[PDB]
């Protein structure tokens, strides 16, 4: 329940939990796919893949350490998990790979075998993971010609034309000290870790700052990846959401909980206290849907994603869903808000407190990099419970009502009507 963080030469952030059997240690850099270019796009993902290379991974396996990495938009992270006792040997492997082997991982035999793996990896994604593929393209069109548009896994064309020098160039511009935070989760104490860190000196590229860019911006638009050979239609639609560290950060997430997620095959899901379900179940407008409030450093996306085999009624799916969202500005009820608060706490809890320290590190790391600290789970609940119907209405009237949208879809989307028809539904006629 304690979020301890101190700075000496490097910023150290930890969160202890004695009941945890293992401990995870790692470095989280304040730069991700949002820092790349259209041409070196996929370099971060490539780094992650060599860090988990058979060679580097075997060295950690002998020592009894497990490797894990995650490439996001605003950040990047390299994590090593171990037993509570080997909390020192994780730091040896961390330093040995980011300073000593910052040239042994980049061999012309390791790099090629890895490049061939991320190529089959990113290709498999585009060929089969339609829901995530669609969600990735949603960011692509919504934030076109802006940092948030670049996909995390990179594109096949920028990937196959990438070389060892590109990795180095990126590493020497972002893997800096002022653009880093060392994180530790599990059971180890803050004072326990900071000592092993403040022990080993050496700055290594100190005072150096990463390159700057241009601010991210939402552009109402769409990308339609029609493919009549797929057995379904997958669509994602959203408005400009909230950036992390926004006053309405929670109002937005609550609003998404009101409509929540659905799965037509799960008996219990068909019974949720969601008004939209009365409309969509009559003719079974979809197999599933899920709302989200994605937040990043400069912006975010608020909307929903859905999958359906009812290809001749896609317009009803979109129409009923948008009519429900209209409600947030004009008629959302106290009980809908209250139901959302309870369910938001339950999901926010299950995230911030899972039985896995690697998840804790990513959540902690990502937060401290943006606001310099982490809001305690109990602090969130105070903010969540304080939200009134009046708040949700003021938010919706600014973010949802008669606002541009961004759309992306693949599969049998002939039935997804034109942009203007969808856009017109972002409001209602009144006297």
């Amino acid at each position: 329940a304690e979020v301890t963080q101190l700075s000496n030469g490097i910023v150290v952030a930890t969160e202890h939990n004695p009941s945890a059997h293992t401990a995870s240690v790692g470095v989280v850099f304040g730069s991700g796919a949002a820092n790349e270019n259209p041409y070196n796009n996929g370099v971060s993902n490539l780094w992650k893949n060599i860090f988990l290379s058979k060679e580097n991974s075997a060295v950690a396996a002998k020592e009894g350490l497990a490797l894990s990495s995650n490439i996001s938009r605003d950040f990047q992270s390299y994590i090593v998990s171990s037993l509570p006792g080997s909390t020192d040997k994780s730091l040896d492997f961390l330093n040995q790979s980011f300073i000593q082997q910052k040239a042994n991982l980049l061999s012309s035999s390791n790099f090629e075998a890895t490049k061939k793996s991320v190529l089959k990896q990113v290709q498999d994604f585009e060929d089969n993971d339609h829901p995530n593929r669609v969600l990735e393209h949603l960011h692509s069109t919504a934030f076109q010609n802006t940092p948030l548009s670049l996909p995390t896994r990179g594109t096949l064309e920028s990937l196959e034309n990438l070389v060892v020098a590109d990795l180095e160039s990126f590493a020497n511009n972002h893997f800096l000290n002022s653009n880093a935070v060392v994180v530790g989760t599990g059971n180890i104490k803050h004072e326990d870790l900071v000592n092993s860190i403040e022990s080993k000196n050496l700055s290594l590229q100190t005072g150096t700052k990463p390159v700057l860019k241009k601010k991210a911006a939402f552009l109402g638009s769409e990308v339609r990846l029609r493919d009549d050979t797929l057995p379904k239609a997958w669509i994602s639609l959203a408005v400009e959401g909230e950036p992390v560290n926004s006053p309405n950060y929670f109002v937005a997430k609550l609003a998404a909980q009101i409509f929540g997620s659905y799965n037509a095959f799960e008996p219990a899901s068909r019974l949720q206290g969601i008004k939209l379900l009365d409309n969509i179940q009559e003719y079974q407008l979809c197999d599933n849907f899920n709302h989200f409030s994605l937040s990043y450093k400069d912006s975010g996306l608020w909307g929903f994603s859905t999958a359906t085999r009812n290809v001749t009624m896609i317009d009803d799916l979109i129409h009923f869903t948008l009519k429900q969202w209209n409600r947030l500005t004009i008629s959302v009820t106290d009980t809908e808000v209250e139901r959302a608060k309870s369910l938001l706490k339950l999901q926010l809890g299950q995230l911030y407190e899972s039985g896995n320290p690697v998840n804790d590190a990513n959540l902690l790391g990502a937060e401290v990099l943006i606001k310099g600290s982490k809001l305690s789970l109990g602090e969130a609940f105070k903010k969540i419970d304080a939200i009134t119907v009046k708040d949700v209405k003021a938010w919706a009237g600014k973010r949802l009502w008669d606002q541009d949208i961004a759309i992306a879809g693949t599969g049998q989307i002939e039935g997804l009507l034109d942009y203007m028809r969808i856009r017109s539904d972002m409001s209602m006629m009144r006297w």
């Binding site: 638009s221 769409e222 001749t312 039935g415």
Partner: protein, 93 residues
């Protein structure tokens, strides 16, 4: 309902076209676009093109008919003037 005869047009989701794959489209909200004023400087010299290719198909048949009309008219005028009463008696009945 009662069985319907097969046609060459369906409806949204089953239009009757061939299966599409590989084509990706993009568009941008009219709201985000430059309000109507840019249809000049960039869209002016480009215009008038769908009549520079067509005017001949219209003009030649028009010319042929206008000439033919003018001729017969002027001939009728001559026939009913003093100078042409001689020719009138000839071509008439």
């Amino acid at each position: 309902g009662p069985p319907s005869g097969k046609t060459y047009m369906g409806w949204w989701g089953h239009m009757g076209g061939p299966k599409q794959k590989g084509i990706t489209s993009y568009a941008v909200s009219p709201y985000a676009q430059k309000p109507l004023q840019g249809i000049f400087h960039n869209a002016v010299f480009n215009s008038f093109r769908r009549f520079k290719s067509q005017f001949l198909y219209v003009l030649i048949p028009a010319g042929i008919y206008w000439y033919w009309w003018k001729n017969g008219n002027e001939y009728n005028e001559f026939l009913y003037s003093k100078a042409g009463r001689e020719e009138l008696e000839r071509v008439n009945v």
